[model samples]
Target: TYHFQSRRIDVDRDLESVHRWLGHPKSHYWDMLNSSLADVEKLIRDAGADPDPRFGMRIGYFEGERQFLFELFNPLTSDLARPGTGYVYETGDIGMHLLVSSSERRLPGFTGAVMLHIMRTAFFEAGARRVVVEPDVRNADVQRLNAAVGFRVAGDFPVPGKTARLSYCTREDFARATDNGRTLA
Candidate 1:
């Protein structure tokens, strides 16, 4: 049996190390397919190196604590943030994208509490209104996890893997859930 815990990583020093984890053996970041290690590294580096504030983090897992999964969380300004173009307007709203490859790890549910705490504390507590995420459309397990955690399926997107779907949550919803979890009341 193993237990998992979350630690805030020092991004400058730990960024590369985390990127490796995303492309490691059976990493879902490889699209649950096959990608040369070099290519995998390049893709991760591109996303992390992007000078976009919205959200970013180094993560995943390691033995003796080494593997770090580089996660990119971006505001849903437009499908995957078109760099030069800024935020989008509504029938739309604000949201986030927590991108990582967990299918290879399978991870049973593959939902990390590290993220749950991060969002609840950072985005929700900081005063964001709405939050959203989009993932490979084929990853049904990931979608179900989002639903169980309280995000609803807003719409579908045509991404690489069966396109993708947008999942969303809100600040008020998060605070209530976090409060309940910590017995904060």
Candidate 2:
């Protein structure tokens, strides 16, 4: 089993680079909509205050401070979306934004285990009552990974230009999803 520990990362020192990463050329969410650095800063600030604390860019770093993944939950504020915008879970008002695992997962011990550790620590330990996301509908492995982590089919939404569906999950569903009796962390 992989040992897991997470450190809460605040963005005072990392605001700029982190924003760039969010809008990086490779991200699906990167509209490249040409928002300014101040705009991005405000975006981060808003997420920190949203009544639904689950959304936004939380640097899910390990206990050692290495970047594990960028976990997104309900916005810290309503600027990015309105009430009817994102997916809602049956058990919790909290909704997931996204959880992007690191590219290092292909490495042996630290990578894969740490990724799961960060996720479990964030979702199970950090009070994630409900979670949801919109990933590439064609990515079957990603979908299965979500299922493995407790997400279920709440419903599907059209992924902008794609014909596939973005899935959903709830806490109760997630609890049962881990049928193997594994401690997610």
Candidate 3:
């Protein structure tokens, strides 16, 4: 059995762990594989300082142990929804980013469990009508995970640092994918 939960990140306490995770080789697609500890600290600080009530920097825990990271932001206010990008803004559209700790023991379906928890947080907890993701186009692993969770790719487009596959998951889509939470537990 798995028990997943999330809470706002504590910058001072969680910085080193997050920095290490971001710099891991597997985190290359995150564009932070070379970030120094201070650089990651600054980034998290900035995210935490953002005044938008819709923005969040969270740490995911399993059985009381921190195991993953995720961020939630309003897509309408992000570059993904900027003009000329072909992205259409929609009410309750939330952008998401996720990274699992590279050093953690890989359990079967662990990532899927984390993904479902985040989705539930987004839709049921945060009132999100749709969830948006823009993962690096080359990150087939993540793209497949996204698909399993009901994210349909809108297309691939250039973001500031990389070409990303823009995908979206509506509330209904997530419900169908998870069998309305029957799979949970």
Candidate 4:
């Protein structure tokens, strides 16, 4: 029931905004919490541009104003490829790293809706068979939301700074979440 618009991240123009969001108290799970704007830019540079085809970044707008960052991963090439037990990366699987910049304007169903939107892009447009995520184990709210959208925890994994619970949704499950074949345009 919500609408959102997304575009590739602009390293020069969006780094400060992303840095500020990560530094916010609500972004405690984010490992980059204390990173400087230069750090953000360097992160982007190292990750390559959104058009890089394997790993990249994008930003989304909800209600025409609120913004969020989406750090996308291509498992075949990303460090996520070697994540922990109980999961294996097929070429058609992708990963997402999301950060909703503002909590004040969040409405019920906002995150779930946007997640499904991202799934549509990954599955329908990019030929992804699955979409994967690894949220910190303590982020209960996020875990619950992921469940609602047909995601199931595969296992726990380790990244540099966070203890993560790896979760995934198959293409069929995501299609069911839509209930009637709606698609993101």
Q: Which candidate is the best by lDDT?
A: 3
The lowest-lDDT stretch of 10 consecutive residues in candidate 3 is 176-185
Over 1-185, each residue of candidate 4 has an lDDT whose tens digit, in order, gives 67777777788688778888888888877667778888878877766644547457778876675477876776656656664444687767878777878567666667777776666666766677888887888899888667766777888877777777988888888777666236321
Alpha carbon deviation, residue 50, candidate 2 (Å):
1.1
Q: Single out the weakest 10-residue window by summed lDDT for candidate 2.
A: 75-84
Could you tell me every candidate's TM-score relative to the true structure? Answer: 0.58, 0.62, 0.92, 0.83
Clashing residue pairs in candidate 3 (N, C-alpha, C atoms within 3 angstroms): none
RMSD of 4: 3.2
lDDT of each: 0.49, 0.50, 0.83, 0.73
Between prediction 1 and prediction 2, which has the larger lDDT? Answer: 2
Best to worst by TM-score, what's the order? 3, 4, 2, 1
lDDT of 2 by residue, 129-178 (tens): 55555655665655656655665554455534653344555556655755
Model 3 alpha-carbon drift over 4 Å, by segment: none
* Candidate 1, 1-185: lDDT as tens digits: 22333344455555445445455554563352455545645654554454654344444443455433434444543365644322333432344444443334444423545346445544534344556666667767667656544666767656434566766666566557556334221
Candidate 2 regions exceeding 4 Å error are 1-4, 30-39, 52-56, 69-72, 75-91, 99-115, 136-141, 158-166, 179-185
TM-score of 2: 0.62
Candidate 3: tens digits of C-alpha lDDT, residues 56-110: 7899987667899998876766679667777777888888999889775677888
Q: Which candidate ranks first by TM-score, i.e. highest?
A: 3
* Model 2, CA-based lDDT: 0.50
